[PDB]
Design an enzyme around this catalytic site. Sequence first.
Site, short mmCIF file in Angstrom:
data_model
loop_
_atom_site.label_atom_id
_atom_site.label_comp_id
_atom_site.label_asym_id
_atom_site.label_seq_id
_atom_site.Cartn_x
_atom_site.Cartn_y
_atom_site.Cartn_z
CD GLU A 104 8.56 2.80 -0.66
OE1 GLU A 104 8.62 2.85 0.58
OE2 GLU A 104 8.81 3.76 -1.43
CD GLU A 157 11.57 6.76 -4.42
OE1 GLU A 157 12.17 6.83 -5.51
OE2 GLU A 157 11.84 7.50 -3.45
#
Length: 306
Positions: A163, A168
């Site tokens: 991430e 994400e």
Amino acid sequence: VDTNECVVDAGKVTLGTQQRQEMDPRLREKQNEIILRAVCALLNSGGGIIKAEIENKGYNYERHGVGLDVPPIFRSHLDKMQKENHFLIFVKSWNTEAGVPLATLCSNLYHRERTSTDVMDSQEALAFLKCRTQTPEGNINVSAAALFDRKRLQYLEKLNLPESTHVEFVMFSTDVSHCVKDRLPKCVSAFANTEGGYVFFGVHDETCQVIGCEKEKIDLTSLRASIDGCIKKLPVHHFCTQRPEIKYVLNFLEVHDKGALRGYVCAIKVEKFCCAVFAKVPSSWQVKDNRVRQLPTREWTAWMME
Ligand code: NA
Ligand SMILES: [Zn+2]
């Protein structure tokens, strides 16, 4: 939230730190939200008084406390009083507090920094809007691009992609329609308002392992439709002339285990936006025509821009 010299009636409420700890959670949240919307309206409407009926008998403010969750910036404008089974909140005018034109419970303008997507507070929102109105760049993340268009992944494989500001990972919830409807607006708002990026639904963030949604719980073509409808539904405000729609790309990645298809990962690339993308209408309120009223996105933005 009824209005009745501006007196706002917030109905019946449970009071006290302990009493509100132990009460029914959905009711606790509903009462707190009623109180906060009333506060925000009065802050933006020249001040006033909130009244509420205390429903728990034996409540005593000095011994029991209050137990409401109020943004700390708002507290300096509030006073509180108990009179028998009634509770009163004195709300003073916002009066351009902190250099932000009006009080807002939630701007609903998200942004992403490192591994965290967060809502902008009012001052961040103001700086962001002022930057976007004054404006007139390479691959976003090629490792993420390589993951994005793959056709198949192995169940529980650990991805090498971490991430970041541009990546994400989000778990599906059991009701994937609610999962997308609740989470995707924040992700899209954040990526559009920041530098663009990729969200992978069906990847666990703490382990970076591929999970996927069970294939029996997914209809691909309708999920693609609902994602498009979610994104088209997001409020935007443009400072530009061309006014483009939000740009994104979607791919479904198959998740296999023991030589059989088991589920899907939903990968979405969201491009950096020219202007502002909201997860939903900003939560800002006022008293208007003897009612507590939410400001439309256009009115909130216009007031924010002074
Ligand atoms: Na790709
Ligand atoms: Zn624009």
